[PDB]
């Protein structure tokens, strides 16, 4: 089963439009950034808001959002299904329903 969260190169605006229509908190998607080629972005719905996070990379080639580092996007995503992607809000990743 291919992952339901990879949307490729979709505009930031299209991600917001799609996510605002989701009904559950945590609905998310990973997209290839248009403003920063080579980078990935994570867009998530929480409440009635849609937020964007940049997938950061370190000198060792690892992916991360804040502190915990991962070897792949897949691992970063799965970890955040039970660990908040936000420091001020409790936002756990949940697959888009479609």
């Amino acid at each position: 089963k291919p992952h339901p969260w990879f949307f490729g190169k979709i505009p930031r605006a299209k991600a917001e439009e799609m996510l605002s229509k989701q009904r559950h908190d945590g609905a998310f998607l990973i997209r290839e950034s248009e403003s920063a080629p080579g980078d990935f972005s994570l867009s998530v719905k929480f409440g009635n808001d849609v937020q964007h996070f940049k997938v950061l990379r370190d000198g060792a080639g690892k992916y991360f959002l804040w502190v915990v580092k991962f070897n792949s996007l897949n691992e970063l995503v799965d970890y955040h299904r039970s660990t908040s992607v936000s420091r001020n809000q409790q936002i756990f990743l949940r697959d888009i329903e479609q």
């Binding site: 930031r12 403003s35 937020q51 964007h52 996070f53 940049k54 959002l65 804040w66």
Partner: peptide, 9 residues
């Protein structure tokens, strides 16, 4: 430019 919750300007 675009803002991200985990990136400080």
């Amino acid at each position: 430019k675009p803002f991200y919750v985990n990136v400080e300007f």
